[PDB]
Amino acid sequence: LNSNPEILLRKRRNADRTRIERQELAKKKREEQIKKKRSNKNK
Amino acid sequence: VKWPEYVRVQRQKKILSIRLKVPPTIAQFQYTLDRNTAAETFKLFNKYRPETAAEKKERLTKEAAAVAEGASPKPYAVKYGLNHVVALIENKKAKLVLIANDVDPIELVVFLPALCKKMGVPYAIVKGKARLGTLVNQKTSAVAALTEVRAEDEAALAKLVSTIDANFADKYDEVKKHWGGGIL
Amino acid sequence: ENTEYSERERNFIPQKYSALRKVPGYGESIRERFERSLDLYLAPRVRKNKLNIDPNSLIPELPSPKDLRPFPIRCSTIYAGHKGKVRTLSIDPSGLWLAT
Amino acid sequence: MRIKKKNTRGNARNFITRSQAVRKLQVSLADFRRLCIFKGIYPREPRNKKKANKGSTAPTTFYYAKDIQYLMHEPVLAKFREHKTFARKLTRALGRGEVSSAKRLEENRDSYTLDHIIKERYPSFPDAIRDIDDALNMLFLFSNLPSTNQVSSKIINDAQKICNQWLAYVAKERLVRKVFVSIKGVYYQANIKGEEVRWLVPFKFPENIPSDVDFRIMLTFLEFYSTLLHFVLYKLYTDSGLIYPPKLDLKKDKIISGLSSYILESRYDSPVASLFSAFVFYVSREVPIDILEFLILSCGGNVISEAAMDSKVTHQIVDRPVLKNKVAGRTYIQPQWIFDCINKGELVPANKYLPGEALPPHLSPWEEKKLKMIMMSNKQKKLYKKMKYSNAKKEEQAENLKKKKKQIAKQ
RNA sequence: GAUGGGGAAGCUCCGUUUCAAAGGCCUGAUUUUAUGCAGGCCACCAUCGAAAGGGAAUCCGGUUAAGAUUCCGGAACCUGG
RNA sequence: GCUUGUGACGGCCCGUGAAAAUCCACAGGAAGGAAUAGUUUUCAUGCCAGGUCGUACUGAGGUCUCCAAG
């Protein structure tokens, strides 16, 4: 029915779920690094 | 839990190392030099790394590339074979003999601390044959000796002798006595 | 801003600027190239046929109702007399007596 | 024959799961994905997802069997193994305490090259220029990045060097057709061997790097596009143009570090390439230079900046509400005029572009039928209703543009 | 009846799950001091041994000096993709 | 009536009545599914393919076995 052949990327799933997950993970490792600094000053 | 055969064997050997009563020529090991004195022994011993195979090769090609086209003192290094260390003690050329506590057959190095006490050689049983290995271009060394020295390091070496005499030989005069391993 | 990301028509707010000097450094630019990079090796590639056609050529070719007369258009006779819903009907074969 | 097992034949040996690809290669997932980035391999969609599995409806991504089966014998995989051996043999040297042998291990180190990986990916030169669309977008982004602990300065300096080589060539052989300044950045279009490439350059401001983005995926894309660009630029220069690579003047790189620097020695067809010839433009301080001097030098004009100080000049480009000097010799323009002269090609009048007035809107260069519904099947009613809704959602948005234009024009 | 083990000067015998590291699958934005793989699920054991045991699915008519549920005509069925 | 197949019963035992390949089913609730072909084919119709070896005949104090007219 006069259709044009082309290629299509499907939407990569869990993009928003992992996005928010990495947003949280980055902040968590920052805070853990700060806690390490203080506890090392108690040595 | 279920472990492998060899894992069970080395764990069984570990608990066997503790729970048996042991003869006083062994357990004269493990009564070894403490952290500060060990670090201070190596702060001297690291200044005398035997010239590694690459360094020796490049230098002796430098001798060839220069001397063939267009005086040096004898250099000092640590001395590291058991045949050679027990040669050097009894010469008597050894000022500090370092002995590993962990040796594959224990029977190898059992005479050595007492032969050093006999000859008057100021010895120290240091912890790790790997740790001795590092300062000597080898995986393992069992023994490391320091015969001669540069005069900059001479006073430090003499004090290293006196520190090891006081820290090691005086604290562990009871170690010639007392069968180790009576841990309940 | 309420809609979840990746199910969104524009990755940006359209904005007006009088001067070219007044154009801000677009902050969410690394995010766009990173998401495209992920779209290359993680998003599944499918061969599709896009049906580029008018909607008008989907209705079958059927004769216009005006050339198929007669047929009833509007109501004439409203039968108001019941207190209950007319569930059933029947007509006589002759054509006068309509039963409810 | 014996009765064949069901779910082992057709779609089961045509496709493989990610887990099955990783396991078959005996390679880490990261390194599997690194090779997948280099080789240009992507998950593919089967007609039956569960026949592609062993029966299971499950969240699964399918690769092509012969694609992974072809990746197995490859020099790059072997060189990844060699990097792993080098890694431990270096930390052996470092961890012991010997520094000289470790320094020597650096000297006796070869690395993987992405040379043969492009021959099998883009066998013809016009095919490589069809990819350079996405390749120049990463690279021009990575030029405009502060170096972090993720990304070294050497990486950004080499990327910027390739960017400047690209800008120098396009301004040399005069291959620009369209420009478009957006919020995102500045788009360009270029007939590079007559196939119209498109690419985006951000604005020269510090860019806030999120901790969300993964600078290990992007580094391998950079690593592939970088080598691809080296080979493209050699091919371009040695065919029609110049020696490669060109040198750069040290005291020119000290002044601008942009495009007026990096001098290039050798040993028209389009109206845009003939525009601005015998015109000398004095670019002022206020405008961004590196986004604008590229366009002037591309078409056929000449650049003298305010920045270089820190004659023949016929136009000045100034973005201030109050302009100070106002001589009779020069003509005063807000850069929008240049961004319209490139798009049209016909030299638009500068009467709508004076300093102090509002600019033009800057366009991109890019009953019975309800009764005849009945005789359609469900497989046609579903599709026709979808096409009706797609045209409705367009036309109502067009009505939104018209209503908003009327509500604004009153004000 | 191999394998693991253990005998035996040995040819080889004991033993069949035994104090064997006996393997085959899933999860993941790429695994946060930067591109060296992490976490989980399951716990018995190779193999040979039946043309009378269990087992997917084919019949009729025809045909030769000698072949037929096998060949031919007709009409079928099962299994896998 | 004879041969054989099958169904429901009733005895005979504390004698409770081979295994595995293969096939199906249930419980379970992981995951997936829409606006220019949503997800699902245990529904209907349509396409292709099915390797090796045995296969002749005899088989009658002296190996086993099937069919059985008046």
PDB file of N, CA, C and O in Angstrom, chain B residues 25-51:
ATOM      1  N   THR B  25      63.742 -24.210  68.784  1.00  0.00           N
ATOM      2  CA  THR B  25      64.506 -23.697  67.633  1.00  0.00           C
ATOM      3  C   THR B  25      63.569 -23.198  66.516  1.00  0.00           C
ATOM      4  O   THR B  25      63.942 -22.320  65.735  1.00  0.00           O
ATOM      5  N   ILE B  26      62.371 -23.780  66.451  1.00  0.00           N
ATOM      6  CA  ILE B  26      61.216 -23.174  65.778  1.00  0.00           C
ATOM      7  C   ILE B  26      60.448 -22.441  66.896  1.00  0.00           C
ATOM      8  O   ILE B  26      60.765 -22.622  68.072  1.00  0.00           O
ATOM      9  N   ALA B  27      59.477 -21.595  66.548  1.00  0.00           N
ATOM     10  CA  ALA B  27      58.877 -20.617  67.487  1.00  0.00           C
ATOM     11  C   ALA B  27      59.895 -19.629  68.085  1.00  0.00           C
ATOM     12  O   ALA B  27      59.530 -18.765  68.881  1.00  0.00           O
ATOM     13  N   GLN B  28      61.161 -19.784  67.702  1.00  0.00           N
ATOM     14  CA  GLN B  28      62.160 -18.724  67.774  1.00  0.00           C
ATOM     15  C   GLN B  28      61.914 -17.778  66.587  1.00  0.00           C
ATOM     16  O   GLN B  28      62.266 -16.591  66.627  1.00  0.00           O
ATOM     17  N   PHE B  29      61.293 -18.335  65.543  1.00  0.00           N
ATOM     18  CA  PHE B  29      60.574 -17.574  64.521  1.00  0.00           C
ATOM     19  C   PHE B  29      59.212 -17.180  65.095  1.00  0.00           C
ATOM     20  O   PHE B  29      58.874 -17.590  66.203  1.00  0.00           O
ATOM     21  N   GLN B  30      58.443 -16.380  64.353  1.00  0.00           N
ATOM     22  CA  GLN B  30      57.151 -15.804  64.811  1.00  0.00           C
ATOM     23  C   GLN B  30      57.245 -14.885  66.051  1.00  0.00           C
ATOM     24  O   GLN B  30      56.305 -14.137  66.340  1.00  0.00           O
ATOM     25  N   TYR B  31      58.365 -14.963  66.774  1.00  0.00           N
ATOM     26  CA  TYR B  31      58.736 -13.979  67.784  1.00  0.00           C
ATOM     27  C   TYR B  31      59.663 -13.038  67.025  1.00  0.00           C
ATOM     28  O   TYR B  31      60.888 -13.058  67.191  1.00  0.00           O
ATOM     29  N   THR B  32      59.041 -12.228  66.172  1.00  0.00           N
ATOM     30  CA  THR B  32      59.718 -11.518  65.087  1.00  0.00           C
ATOM     31  C   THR B  32      59.704  -9.995  65.279  1.00  0.00           C
ATOM     32  O   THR B  32      58.997  -9.475  66.151  1.00  0.00           O
ATOM     33  N   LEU B  33      60.496  -9.308  64.454  1.00  0.00           N
ATOM     34  CA  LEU B  33      60.700  -7.862  64.521  1.00  0.00           C
ATOM     35  C   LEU B  33      59.422  -7.074  64.235  1.00  0.00           C
ATOM     36  O   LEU B  33      58.724  -7.350  63.253  1.00  0.00           O
ATOM     37  N   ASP B  34      59.128  -6.102  65.102  1.00  0.00           N
ATOM     38  CA  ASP B  34      57.872  -5.332  65.049  1.00  0.00           C
ATOM     39  C   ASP B  34      57.825  -4.309  63.906  1.00  0.00           C
ATOM     40  O   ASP B  34      58.838  -4.074  63.239  1.00  0.00           O
ATOM     41  N   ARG B  35      56.650  -3.700  63.709  1.00  0.00           N
ATOM     42  CA  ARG B  35      56.342  -2.891  62.516  1.00  0.00           C
ATOM     43  C   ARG B  35      57.278  -1.706  62.227  1.00  0.00           C
ATOM     44  O   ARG B  35      57.660  -1.492  61.071  1.00  0.00           O
ATOM     45  N   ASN B  36      57.641  -0.959  63.272  1.00  0.00           N
ATOM     46  CA  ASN B  36      58.479   0.231  63.126  1.00  0.00           C
ATOM     47  C   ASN B  36      59.901  -0.136  62.718  1.00  0.00           C
ATOM     48  O   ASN B  36      60.438   0.436  61.768  1.00  0.00           O
ATOM     49  N   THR B  37      60.483  -1.101  63.427  1.00  0.00           N
ATOM     50  CA  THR B  37      61.851  -1.553  63.178  1.00  0.00           C
ATOM     51  C   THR B  37      61.977  -2.280  61.830  1.00  0.00           C
ATOM     52  O   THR B  37      63.022  -2.197  61.184  1.00  0.00           O
ATOM     53  N   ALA B  38      60.914  -2.978  61.422  1.00  0.00           N
ATOM     54  CA  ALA B  38      60.853  -3.647  60.115  1.00  0.00           C
ATOM     55  C   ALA B  38      60.834  -2.641  58.966  1.00  0.00           C
ATOM     56  O   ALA B  38      61.539  -2.822  57.969  1.00  0.00           O
ATOM     57  N   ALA B  39      60.035  -1.585  59.124  1.00  0.00           N
ATOM     58  CA  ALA B  39      59.954  -0.484  58.161  1.00  0.00           C
ATOM     59  C   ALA B  39      61.262   0.307  58.074  1.00  0.00           C
ATOM     60  O   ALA B  39      61.613   0.820  57.010  1.00  0.00           O
ATOM     61  N   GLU B  40      61.971   0.385  59.200  1.00  0.00           N
ATOM     62  CA  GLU B  40      63.214   1.143  59.309  1.00  0.00           C
ATOM     63  C   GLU B  40      64.397   0.340  58.781  1.00  0.00           C
ATOM     64  O   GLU B  40      65.386   0.921  58.317  1.00  0.00           O
ATOM     65  N   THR B  41      64.293  -0.988  58.873  1.00  0.00           N
ATOM     66  CA  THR B  41      65.274  -1.907  58.279  1.00  0.00           C
ATOM     67  C   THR B  41      65.203  -1.830  56.753  1.00  0.00           C
ATOM     68  O   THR B  41      66.233  -1.848  56.080  1.00  0.00           O
ATOM     69  N   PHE B  42      63.984  -1.718  56.230  1.00  0.00           N
ATOM     70  CA  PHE B  42      63.748  -1.668  54.792  1.00  0.00           C
ATOM     71  C   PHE B  42      63.993  -0.289  54.202  1.00  0.00           C
ATOM     72  O   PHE B  42      64.340  -0.183  53.029  1.00  0.00           O
ATOM     73  N   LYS B  43      63.830   0.759  55.011  1.00  0.00           N
ATOM     74  CA  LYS B  43      64.223   2.115  54.608  1.00  0.00           C
ATOM     75  C   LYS B  43      65.728   2.224  54.322  1.00  0.00           C
ATOM     76  O   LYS B  43      66.146   3.080  53.538  1.00  0.00           O
ATOM     77  N   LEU B  44      66.519   1.351  54.950  1.00  0.00           N
ATOM     78  CA  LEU B  44      67.941   1.202  54.625  1.00  0.00           C
ATOM     79  C   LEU B  44      68.176   0.201  53.487  1.00  0.00           C
ATOM     80  O   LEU B  44      68.919   0.498  52.550  1.00  0.00           O
ATOM     81  N   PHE B  45      67.544  -0.970  53.584  1.00  0.00           N
ATOM     82  CA  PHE B  45      67.714  -2.073  52.623  1.00  0.00           C
ATOM     83  C   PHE B  45      67.216  -1.762  51.202  1.00  0.00           C
ATOM     84  O   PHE B  45      67.698  -2.363  50.238  1.00  0.00           O
ATOM     85  N   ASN B  46      66.263  -0.834  51.077  1.00  0.00           N
ATOM     86  CA  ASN B  46      65.742  -0.403  49.771  1.00  0.00           C
ATOM     87  C   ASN B  46      66.720   0.478  48.991  1.00  0.00           C
ATOM     88  O   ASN B  46      66.564   0.660  47.779  1.00  0.00           O
ATOM     89  N   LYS B  47      67.716   1.024  49.687  1.00  0.00           N
ATOM     90  CA  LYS B  47      68.764   1.842  49.065  1.00  0.00           C
ATOM     91  C   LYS B  47      69.836   0.986  48.376  1.00  0.00           C
ATOM     92  O   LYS B  47      70.703   1.512  47.671  1.00  0.00           O
ATOM     93  N   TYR B  48      69.761  -0.329  48.584  1.00  0.00           N
ATOM     94  CA  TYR B  48      70.714  -1.279  48.018  1.00  0.00           C
ATOM     95  C   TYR B  48      70.032  -2.418  47.259  1.00  0.00           C
ATOM     96  O   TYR B  48      70.350  -3.595  47.465  1.00  0.00           O
ATOM     97  N   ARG B  49      69.086  -2.059  46.391  1.00  0.00           N
ATOM     98  CA  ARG B  49      68.516  -3.020  45.451  1.00  0.00           C
ATOM     99  C   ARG B  49      69.606  -3.495  44.502  1.00  0.00           C
ATOM    100  O   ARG B  49      70.283  -2.664  43.887  1.00  0.00           O
ATOM    101  N   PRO B  50      69.808  -4.832  44.412  1.00  0.00           N
ATOM    102  CA  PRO B  50      70.697  -5.375  43.386  1.00  0.00           C
ATOM    103  C   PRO B  50      70.199  -4.937  42.018  1.00  0.00           C
ATOM    104  O   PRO B  50      68.994  -4.986  41.751  1.00  0.00           O
ATOM    105  N   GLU B  51      71.127  -4.464  41.193  1.00  0.00           N
ATOM    106  CA  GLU B  51      70.822  -3.892  39.889  1.00  0.00           C
ATOM    107  C   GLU B  51      70.072  -4.901  39.014  1.00  0.00           C
ATOM    108  O   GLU B  51      70.641  -5.913  38.585  1.00  0.00           O
TER     109      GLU B  51
END
